[PDB]
Amino acid sequence: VAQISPQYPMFTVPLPIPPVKQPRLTVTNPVNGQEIWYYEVEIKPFTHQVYPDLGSADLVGYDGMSPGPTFQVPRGVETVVRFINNAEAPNSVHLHGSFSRAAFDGWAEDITEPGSFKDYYYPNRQSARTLWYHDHAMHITAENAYRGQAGLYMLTDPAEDALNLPSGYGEFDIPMILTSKQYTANGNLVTTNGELNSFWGDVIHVNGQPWPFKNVEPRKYRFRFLDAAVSRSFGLYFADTDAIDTRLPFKVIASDSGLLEHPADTSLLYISMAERYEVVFDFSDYAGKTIELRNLGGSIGGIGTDTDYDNTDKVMRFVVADDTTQPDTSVVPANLRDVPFPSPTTNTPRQFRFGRTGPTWTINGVAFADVQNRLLANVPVGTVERWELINAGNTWTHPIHIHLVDFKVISRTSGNNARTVMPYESGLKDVVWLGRRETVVVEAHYAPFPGVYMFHCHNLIHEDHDMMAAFNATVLPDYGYNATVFVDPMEELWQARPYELGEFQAQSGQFSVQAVTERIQTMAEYRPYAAADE
């Protein structure tokens, strides 16, 4: 249907690459003698001229940019990130794809008010994967993500580096953060505030830029796709501009949780909110061509309900040179890794229905605001469970996400007989798309940390109103590991703390080297991640 946002100069601005975030300090962990990387991120308002010939857009971002800066962290290095709110609304940071302790996971009520900060302690022990960090503040997650609070966090492993996949952040390893927004006639953002169904957006962005282009060489590139949109799901394909309907083959190498067992030969990639898929595209057969990255219409080929607009079939263009300046020394091995699947279980799947209760998006008829009723599952730590995720609706779709865990997709049924499990769903994931009338069974090891964790739809409008609940990964009282201080996301020890802006700007007082060092060493003594050792 007709674009609402102003006409945009399509494919004229280069694809921006978010800069890599550098830690301020390293602190010796007195428990293990290892260095903890300490980072400071300032959440603040800024403006950005998205439309060349109109006014600016008002944004609020990590370090006053959108997307947020990219973290690049090796497995085995613990990090602490001081997320400092210097904005106008509260925040809660979640590292999506990290088995963080409950009080470092971005529990929706575990907020930082403007003029406060929270220290988040991350383990960085899981399989190499594309994580992302984004806002999770109760009721305002959609608008906080939409106005710019999302960034990438790449967990690296030299074992993955030895596969010789296309490499170098911003060279042949390219972040592809997809959003879908709407703009006013003067080039400001249309707010998601007041939307209670879905905010589709009519302007497609990659790394914060509407409809960009990139100059590429005729060789293989790693693309790290993330759907960071509020409500738009995508069916991605690549096409020569000389045959814009003919899909070109590519390989999917990784899902949310890390590498597939084998690359999946693909010409169409379904990706819904919060899904990461890493793709290798080989431009070598397309020297001197223009390859358009496009998006399936028809509400993602009858799987979704998303509105299509005039230009939401277009994502970006790749202008391919006639030859490479350096040899392509990259490869996509037929065997990528042994995926660490959980044990199969014979236990009766739990059932969760994602539907509506009057006007509210609910799980089993419950809204996250309803403290009394929102704790829908108690699961002993170390248990494997199958969850049957049911979308009985034909007029909504729900990408479902479970915190803490990686899961295997066991089965999909479609009441429209549309599809089953996709080949790129063969590995481990943490989001799965319930298309129209879809039921998906996932199987997950509820390990290794006890605590209260969220699961929800990652359509942020649904999530905000109010399609989110909690599970408690439980332990017996003789279980050690300081569990009494790490099970409760609201534990006073880990709460946000007020700061003076001068202190921050001068790196004095509680931002002195002494104060940060004492704080992180005290945190480290509690040994939050010890139960994941080996």
Ligand X SMILES: *[C@@H]1O[C@H](CO)[C@@H](O[C@@H]2O[C@H](CO)[C@@H](O[C@@H]3O[C@H](CO)[C@@H](O)[C@H](O[C@H]4O[C@H](CO)[C@@H](O)[C@H](O)[C@@H]4O)[C@@H]3O)[C@H](O)[C@H]2NC(C)=O)[C@H](O)[C@H]1NC(C)=O
Ligand Y SMILES: *[C@@H]1O[C@H](CO)[C@@H](O[C@@H]2O[C@H](CO)[C@@H](O)[C@H](O)[C@H]2NC(C)=O)[C@H](O)[C@H]1NC(C)=O
What is the contact surface with ligand Y in residues (CB under 6 A)?
480-482, 525-527, 530
CA distance 500 to 81: 18
Binding residue for ligand X, selected from 102, 236, 483, 520, defined by CB under 6 A: 483
| Contact in structure between 339 and 428 (CB atoms under 8 Å) | yes
Please name every residue paired with 472 in a beta bridge, in sequence order, or none if there are none: 378, 452
Q: Which of residues 317-376 bind ligand X (CB under 6 A)?
A: 375
Residue with smaller CB distance to ligand Y, 88 or 534: 534
CA distance 269 to 265: 10
Tell me, what DSSP letter sits at residue 395?
A: S
Catalogue the E-assigned strands of 157-282: 173-181, 203-206, 209-210, 213-216, 220-227, 234-240, 250-255, 258-266, 269-271, 276-282
374: part of which helix (H) or strand (E)?
helix 371-374
Q: Which of residues 47-86 bind ligand X (CB under 6 A)?
A: none
Binding residue for Cu ion, selected from 274, 293, 440, 496, defined by CB under 5 A: 274
Residue with smaller CB distance to Cu ion, 202 or 438: 438
Q: Is 475 in the site for ligand X (CB under 6 A)?
A: yes
Q: Please, what is the minimum distance in Å from the beta carbon of residue 396 to Cu ion?
A: 6
CA distance 136 to 92: 5
Window of 103-111, 149-157, 454-462, 471-479 that interacts with ligand X by CB under 6 A: 471-479
Q: Is 193 in the site for ligand X (CB under 6 A)?
A: no
CA distance 336 to 516: 40
To the question of whether residue 316 is assigned a binding role by annotation, the answer is no
Q: Is 452 in the site for ligand X (CB under 6 A)?
A: yes
Q: Please, what is the minimum distance in Å from the beta carbon of residue 302 to ligand X?
A: 41
Q: Is 448 in the site for ligand X (CB under 6 A)?
A: no
Q: Is 96 in the site for Cu ion (CB under 5 A)?
A: yes
x-or-dash string of contact with ligand X, 213-252, rule CB under 6 A: ----------------------------------------
Q: Is 487 in the site for ligand X (CB under 6 A)?
A: yes
CA distance 149 to 46: 12
Closest of 425, 62, 72, 105 to residue 272, by C-alpha: 425
Alpha-carbon torsion (9, 12, 18, 19), positive or negative? negative
To the question of whether residue 134 is assigned a binding role by annotation, the answer is yes
CA distance 355 to 358: 10
Q: Is 129 in the site for Cu ion (CB under 5 A)?
A: no
Q: Is 484 in the site for ligand X (CB under 6 A)?
A: yes
* Residue ranges of the binding site for Cu cation: 94, 96, 134, 136, 398, 401, 403, 456-458, 462, 467
Contact footprint for ligand X (CB under 6 A) = 375, 450, 452, 472, 474-475, 477, 483-484, 487
